[PDB]
Symmetry: C4
Subunit: 140 residues, 4 copies
């Protein structure tokens, strides 16, 4: 029996339970976005704004149900409307991560017919992050 560690084992939603994505694996996810005609977008946050929190609820009456701070991140430029070139998306990932090297950065895509985000995963975490485990150290 192995024990799943509760210490410094924070996750990041879709794909965070898998080995970290190689550049080839990221490119394949971008191909998927383009093949389906979805709108790519990049979002970023400083470490203190990265995970869901409750601080604003201090101002509330009994209305905190499904309210969390830090769900919104900051938009990198605009969503890439009409983009059908995967290389353009990859180039923006480089540009975003270069401008904000200490930020969490996630790649998302939107479906305008359902009007919802249809995909999303982390592409960068700051090198100073100490709150997550490598795959082989998630259980002990």
């Amino acid at each position: 029996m192995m024990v799943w560690t509760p210490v410094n084992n924070k996750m990041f939603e879709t794909f965070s339970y898998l080995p970290p994505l190689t550049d080839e694996q990221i490119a394949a996810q971008v191909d998927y976005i383009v093949a389906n005609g979805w709108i790519p977008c990049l979002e970023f946050a400083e470490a203190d704004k990265a995970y869901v929190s409750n601080e604003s609820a201090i101002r509330f009456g009994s209305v905190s149900c499904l309210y969390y701070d830090n769900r919104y991140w900051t938009m990198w430029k605009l969503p890439m409307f009409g983009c059908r070139d995967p290389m353009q998306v990859l180039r923006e990932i480089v540009a975003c991560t270069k401008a904000f090297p200490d930020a969490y950065v996630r790649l998302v895509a939107f479906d305008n017919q359902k009007q919802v985000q249809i995909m999303g995963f982390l592409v960068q975490r700051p090198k100073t992050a100490r709150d997550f485990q490598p795959a082989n150290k998630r259980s002990v």
Copy 2:
């Protein structure tokens, strides 16, 4: 008259007002668990999750009565159902504390007829803990 210190004198429920348990005394408590047919289990927590706190109540209306965070700790493996060997329990204490050397670790036991925890006491505190007193320094 001696004065009971309010400073760095945190306790840990059952047996925390006695001298720290020797290995022989721990083994005697394990014998008691086995003699009574109770189910041994180990639980652990990092220092920040060890003592009762109130943080989640920020999300509440007027319903905090008997709500506290950090009552739940993390289960080490599973409760040792059908265990009738004290040495097996002692070996799991060693294994748990080895995997989590900086965690608080407590030994508990369950009664499945009453469906309640029937015993429990701390078996490890992190060496970095500064918030407790020696038995002879509890009063000044």
Copy 3:
């Protein structure tokens, strides 16, 4: 496309989106106060009391609407009633910032007919402040 930074880019109300005021530009604003017969006043706050916060709302029922802590700063001496000399205002800025070199300091002016503050802008921030950007680093 340039991206407006969300990191360490705190503002300070009126004139914060312009290049920092030169001594000549500050003098011109003081002239404006005097030309209009308004009442100059200086206010200051330590860094922890400088920006709007919510901490007191822990004590509230559902009445936090338009309540914020840190809107009030500390008055430097008294408002300069009857002041008809711009140099006198400039001298008090020097005096205030000298007494509190590590404080935020703002110059304000009051209109007693409308009974409202009619102007205001920051004249000093502590040299240790790192939560703001110069104009050329506001977008990347």
Copy 4:
């Protein structure tokens, strides 16, 4: 005009606006307690428990009116019932401050007919305290 400082200028109720009490002035206050037949008592607190705070109100509905944490301090021994000797009080101040050299310590006195604390003032603050001004630095 002198400006009353808002920074690190915390007070301590009765007598805190006067020059610090000399040993002769403390002895005089003790004579006053004894002359009036009041009951001397010492109380103390670590720095984090010294000033009124709000933390427990996170657990409340709309009932925080005249609730504050840190009004209660810790009793040194017991109130000195039947004490008619000032030297005995002075000896307990020495003993208390010796046992808790890093604590805030206050001398108080009770009237059992009104059933209320009838006097009180600080006799020790920790040497590490940096949140107070000497009398000559309270205004600038």
